[PDB]
Amino acid sequence: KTPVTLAKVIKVLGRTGSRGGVTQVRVEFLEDTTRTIVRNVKGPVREGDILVLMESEREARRLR
Amino acid sequence: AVGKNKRLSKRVVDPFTRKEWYDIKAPSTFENRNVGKTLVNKSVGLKNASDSLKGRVVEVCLADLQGSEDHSFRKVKLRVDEVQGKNLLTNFHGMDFTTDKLRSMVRKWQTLIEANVTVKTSDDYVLRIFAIAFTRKQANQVKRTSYAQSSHIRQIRKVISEILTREVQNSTLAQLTSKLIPEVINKEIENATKDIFPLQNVHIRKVKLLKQPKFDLGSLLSLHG
């Protein structure tokens, strides 16, 4: 199948990673807007973007 | 992954076509007597399943047997002994606490007192019972610790031991379980040691079982329905 889902960030939880080049945000689904995840992003984001996810059960873990 | 040195030192089937479900029936001392279902191989003439069922020990939360949630942290093990066909009967096998509650009450700055007693009930069932109690900070104790001296602990152990012996030798595990459900032994043990020491959280945990006399069908069927 093609379970491509979307998720609009509601807040950005600083920038993580050893490189210092990835960030961590709290995304909320376009559907069921009470269901949120924490996810890692690689690039410039701000409050308002719509990420595309091929997963929904994954949660972000701080990169070391 | 998918790695295996193949150090071996299609005839494939689905093992669920040759299987079915039996039902677990609780003793009448509990309310929700419909416990659950158990998966079993299909009956074979050479080896009958009903032989294989007997001896099974199902582990069920006590609150799942009485509907309430005051018995959430307890747990009861039932023994499969008699199969009526598409429905089997379970006798009491043991009791235990949930580790969550046990660790929840085993806290610092108070002495835990443990009482152990191996006894014989009114019938020839032989049981082992463990009781656990915790000294209680008084409702006026500005002193922060709540420790108990060794003399108080030994006296409390003696009292709990004699109470447990009394309430085992004077009843059967049918009546004993019917007594365990409303944990009146806990209240009685707390009251009998009220003068010695406060003793918060007097509980009876891990009611073991060490022997069964014979196979008495009459009371087992009498215990159901």
Partner: protein
């Protein structure tokens, strides 16, 4: 009860290669044993949350085909004389079990904790690293 056919999830999450192993109430019958190392490549991420996630999806699918609709979680650490703290993957395994339609009842921790260890491996000075 509305005939929720029950099982026990019985997760075992060591510090490597967590286990998801559902059984009936008795526990004498084992179905859908698929583990963490069953589904992930690196051989080092058997403990990873993704490993337990895929293992959990497989056991959920297999049990749903069976007929069992609700499960009882029995989380176990490696236990014994070992670390006995729950593995990283077990929590993801439980979350994915609760995701895939299955109903959840009576989470318990059943790690084998001793009244004492016989002897803990590593010597008196332990693992020097």
């Amino acid at each position: 009860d509305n005939s929720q056919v029950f099982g026990v999830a019985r997760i075992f999450a060591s510090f490597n290669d967590t286990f998801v192993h559902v059984t009936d109430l008795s526990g004498r019958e084992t179905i859908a044993r698929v583990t963490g190392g069953m589904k992930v490549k690196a051989d080092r991420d058997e403990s990873s949350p993704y490993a337990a996630m895929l293992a959990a999806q497989d056991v959920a699918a297999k049990c749903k085909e069976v007929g069992i609709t609700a499960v009882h979680i029995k989380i176990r650490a490696t236990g014994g004389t070992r670390s006995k703290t729950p593995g990283p993957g077990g929590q993801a395994a439980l979350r994915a079990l609760a995701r895939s339609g299955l109903r959840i009842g009576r989470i318990e921790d059943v790690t084998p904790v001793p009244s004492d260890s016989t002897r803990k491996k590593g010597g008196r000075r332990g693992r020097r690293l």
